[PDB]
Structures are given as structure tokens and as C-alpha cells.
């Protein structure tokens, strides 16, 4: 229930000269950290994929893909460019009752290997935030994973709020 306060935005960098056409495509969720208490099901978490399709109006068609309860589950959002390149909000945010704020910021990427993305939103007056370590493949360097840990901790999140999901074959490849 209880939430670690969101970091000030001074603490979250923005990838300089972001190239929307190179961030395009599949990214695997190699690591994730959030401000919400994590319940452990007696199960390690399975890896997911997120696909960023760039459109003609320079917005992203984002599709999250999951293997949950023995099926493939898809979820779609529209991300529209924010003030700067690398920043995004939700198209039609006034469509969603109680959802008053939504920010995506690409912290750092090299486009062909790794990415770190910061998500913040306020829903019903509760501030929730996450950091995702994305990879072009299902695995990443220790150095990179350590970097992500270090970055997450700098945002106020404790060690045990950080997860590295286990690589799987269902849904995410096809």
C-alpha cells in the first residue's frame, strides 16, 4: 500500500539527442524496479517484451507482451511526444478518470543493446513510478545490470524493490 515518494525530476536524466526511429522495435524487460510493495508469490517473475512502433505523427504505438496464466496477454498504449525528444505522455489522458499524470522518459540508450526508461504516473492521487532496464536480447552485461541497480537506488528505491525477470520462450519471441 505505502509508497516511496517519487524522485524530483532533477534526478532523472534524459538521453541527449534521442532518435525516435532508432528506439523503434522490440525491447525485452531484463530488469524492473518500482515504488510499490512487492508480494512474492513463491515464484520468480517471467520476462516480458515491449514493442515501440513509431507512427507518421511521431507518436508511439506501445505493446506490452506477457505470458500469464498460460496465455499470451497484450496491452496497448499511445505515447505522444512530450516537451523534449525522449519524453512521452499518454495520448488522451483526460479520457481516463482519476489518471491525472503520466510521464515516460528514456534515461539512456544505445539503441542496439540496452535502454533505461523511467515511468511516472498519478492515479487517484497516488504517485507510482518504475524503472525498466530494456535489452535488445534477453540478457545483459553485469556492468549494465549493476548500473541499473545503482540508478534505481539513486531514485530512492531499496535493493529488494529491484527484480530481474527470468528469460522465457512463450509469447515474447513470436
Amino acid at each position: 500500500s505505502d509508497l516511496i515518494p517519487a524522485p524530483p525530476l532533477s534526478k532523472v536524466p534524459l538521453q541527449q539527442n534521442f532518435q525516435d526511429n532508432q528506439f523503434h522495435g522490440k525491447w525485452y524487460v531484463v530488469g524492473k524496479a518500482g515504488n510499490h510493495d512487492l508480494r512474492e508469490d513463491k515464484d520468480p517473475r517471467k520476462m516480458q517484451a515491449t514493442i515501440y512502433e513509431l507512427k507518421e505523427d511521431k507518436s508511439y504505438n506501445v505493446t506490452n507482451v506477457r505470458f500469464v496464466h498460460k496465455k499470451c496477454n497484450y496491452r496497448i498504449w499511445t505515447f505522444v511526444p512530450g516537451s523534449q525528444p525522449g519524453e512521452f505522455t499518454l495520448g488522451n489522458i483526460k479520457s481516463w478518470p482519476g489518471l491525472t499524470s503520466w510521464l515516460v522518459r528514456v534515461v539512456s540508450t544505445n539503441y542496439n543493446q540496452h535502454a533505461m526508461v523511467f515511468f511516472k504516473r498519478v492515479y487517484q492521487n497516488r504517485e507510482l513510478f518504475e524503472i525498466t532496464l530494456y535489452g535488445r536480447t534477453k540478457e545483459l552485461t553485469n556492468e549494465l545490470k549493476e548500473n541499473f541497480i545503482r540508478f534505481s537506488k539513486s531514485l530512492g528505491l531499496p535493493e529488494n524493490h529491484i527484480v530481474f525477470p527470468v528469460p522465457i520462450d512463450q509469447c515474447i519471441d513470436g
Partner: protein
């Protein structure tokens, strides 16, 4: 001069569609009554209305104003063939929201919605939104016409709380959202079975719900005669059976098995068995 009314208050009730205009009566002693007018401030929209009340009255009503339009309301003190300077204010009556949104046909992946379509002629449709309550993640959005009062949300996950909203729409505006939380069903086990029956023990067996990953099963049991004596067992989701020990001979027991996901449990599967 004829002194105008004071303390003008305007209350637009969106549920009844009625505007109630109120004021403090003039200080002038011998008056005929009050004249109250309704005038849209946007010169391309709506129309004007006029009402008249007695000298001892200090409110009037207007129905069938257009939700979302701005209206200037003026109240004039009346004295025979003479009128005071008016007191005036503006109001924008709200779009009515639904008052009887209910849920029906709740399954593991689906939620049915019902409501009474509102009887306001400038309503042109409804917006349905579905948001995952736990994380504030938008899931689904759709539109139905002004005469529809049913909808089935599909493609959901089981054991999850969803905030579901229906928002009434006009051209260029909408109501406050009618939002309710509805959990998807956790699917029950089926086909309760009793084997290997002895004086003090029994094997309880069931069929798992298909294609779901449960946290656990939860087995509850108690004697028929004293049903406040309930014992509770937690069973692995991969097991379909449990051996109950330490029971009484020649005694009838009630046993239930419930599926559990994320603390949320299914309706129970219940049966009676005598040792």
C-alpha cells in the same frame, strides 16, 4: 428606486435536469412579484425562457436547459408596470451522470455492464473506460450510442480489481464519471471427490480450474453439527488432493475447496462426507 433582489443563488441539479434560481426578496414594501429570465450567453446556442412568481416567493425553476451551455440568469423586482434593475449571474449546468451502473455476468475474463440510458436529448453517447485499479494502468476504452445501456468488457485477467467508468457525452462536454470497482472472478475447482475413507482420515480430491496459475488452493472443513469449528489448510496449486487427518469416527463433515489468486478466492466447492 425599486430595489432589486439580493443574494442571488443558482443551483443546477444534473440528476433532475432542473435549474433552481433563488434570491433574497426586495426591501421595497409593496411589490407585484418577480420576473426571472434565462438567456444563453453563446448567441448561437439554446434559447430564452421567462418565469414569473408572487411577491412572497423567492425561488423559481426552469427545466430543459441544455447541459454544458452557459446561461445568464436575471431576476427583476416587479411593481405593477415598473421593474427594478436586475440582479444577474451565470451558470453552466452539468451533464447528467449515470446513477444505476451495475455489473452482471461476471467471469474470470469478462464483466457485463448495465445502466438506464439517461433521458436528456443532447446526450450523444457514452464513454466506457477500464483501468487496472492496483497500478492505474489503462486497459480498454470504447463508445456506445445514446440509446445503449449494456456493455460486455472482454479480454481481462482473473482475480484483478478493475475501475470501470461510464461517462455521459454531449458534443464538446461530458459528465463526471460514474466509476465503480469490479473484481474478475477467480475460477472455482469442480467435481469434489472423496476416497480412502477411514475412521479418522479421508482423501479429498478435486478438478482444478483450467489455464490459470493459482497462488494456492484453500481447503476448509468442519463437522456438520458444530459448524463454527473450522479448520483451514493451504495446498499447493499443482496439487489436486489432500489427506485430512485427526478426524472423528462416525461423523459427517462439510468440506470446501477454494481457488486462490493474489489473496482473492473463488466461490467454494462444497460437499458432505461421513466417516
Amino acid at each position: 428606486p425599486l430595489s432589486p433582489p439580493t443574494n442571488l443563488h443558482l443551483e443546477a441539479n444534473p440528476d433532475t435536469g432542473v435549474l433552481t434560481v433563488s434570491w433574497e426578496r426586495s426591501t421595497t414594501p409593496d411589490i407585484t412579484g418577480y420576473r426571472i429570465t434565462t438567456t444563453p450567453t453563446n448567441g448561437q446556442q439554446g434559447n430564452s425562457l421567462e418565469e414569473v412568481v408572487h411577491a412572497d416567493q423567492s425561488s423559481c425553476t426552469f427545466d430543459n436547459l441544455s447541459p454544458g451551455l452557459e446561461y445568464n440568469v436575471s431576476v427583476y423586482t416587479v411593481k405593477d408596470d415598473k421593474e427594478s434593475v436586475p440582479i444577474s449571474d451565470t451558470i453552466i449546468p452539468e451533464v447528467p451522470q449515470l446513477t444505476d451502473l451495475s455489473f452482471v455476468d461476471i467471469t474470470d475474463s469478462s464483466i457485463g455492464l448495465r445502466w438506464t440510458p439517461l433521458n436528456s436529448s443532447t446526450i450523444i453517447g457514452y464513454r466506457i473506460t477500464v483501468v487496472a485499479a492496483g497500478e492505474g494502468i489503462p486497459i480498454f476504452e470504447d463508445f456506445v450510442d445514446s440509446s445503449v445501456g449494456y456493455y460486455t468488457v472482454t479480454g481481462l485477467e482473473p482475480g484483478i480489481d478493475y475501475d470501470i467508468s461510464v461517462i455521459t457525452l454531449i458534443n464538446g462536454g461530458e459528465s463526471a464519471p460514474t466509476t465503480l470497482t469490479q473484481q474478475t472472478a477467480v475460477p472455482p475447482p469442480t467435481d469434489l471427490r472423496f476416497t480412502n475413507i477411514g475412521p479418522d482420515t479421508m482423501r479429498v480430491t478435486w478438478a482444478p480450474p483450467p489455464s490459470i496459475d493459482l497462488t494456492n488452493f484453500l481447503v476448509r472443513y468442519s463437522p456438520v453439527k458444530n459448524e463454527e469449528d473450522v479448520a483451514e489448510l493451504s495446498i499447493s496449486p499443482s496439487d489436486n488432493a489432500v489427506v485430512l487427518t485427526n478426524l472423528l469416527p462416525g461423523t459427517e463433515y462439510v468440506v470446501s475447496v477454494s481457488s486462490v489468486y493474489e489473496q482473492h478466492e473463488s466461490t467454494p466447492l462444497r460437499g458432505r462426507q461421513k466417516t
